[PDB]
Amino acid sequence: ENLYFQSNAMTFAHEVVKSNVKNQVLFNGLTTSKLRNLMEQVNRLYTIAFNSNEDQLNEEFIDELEYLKIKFYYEAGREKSVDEFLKKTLMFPIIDRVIKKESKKFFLDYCKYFEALVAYAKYYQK
Template identity: 35%
Template sequence: MTILTDENYVDIAEKAILKLERNTRNRKNPDAFFLTTSKLRNLLSLTSTLFDESKVKEYDALLDRIAYLRVQFVYQAGREIAVKDLIEKAQILEALKEIKDRETLQRFCRYMEALVAYFKFYGGKD
């Protein structure tokens, strides 16, 4: 599956969020995600700056930043199992490898926004 060339990337984001692990041991809310909104927003903030830069800079000037973004996602996944769950189920690393030009870079950033939106919609909290 190619996320960034699929017109249904928003639907793909929704399905990924629905697959995330839930904290069934949480007595107050047994349907709560292990992942928190703040952790997800930290990932989104990494992409937001890149999206803004993609509007004014040439794609080639952003290649190093895109590679660093991939490293940051891997690092965050290694630190937190809930982040790793998101990265695997949302196929974020695969999507990062699909970035080939400005259009697919911006599509990736919108995919990340869709993940955050569906996370909040389905009850994601801090």
């Protein structure tokens, strides 16, 4: 078989981003201003998760997640660096996973992953 290990979200964000500096461009011309609309969408959801007492995610929140997937695919259609970024980050199967588990802790973990993705993208830029 093979031999794989336990990497938290921060470590793997750093790895994906720094492994997508090629010869210098980031994910083929990504910048952070291209992710702004997305960042805001994530932020507006983060706070509403933070205020939720229980871990069981409200159903309107799931609709919001569906719309988040939709805004993702929009930006991926708009800008090719966003398309590469979203594929190589596994953004979509992770959004799916969050939607299935419907837990608050898990979505906040996803938010940390997204936040570190953007930070590291920022640290490596033109």
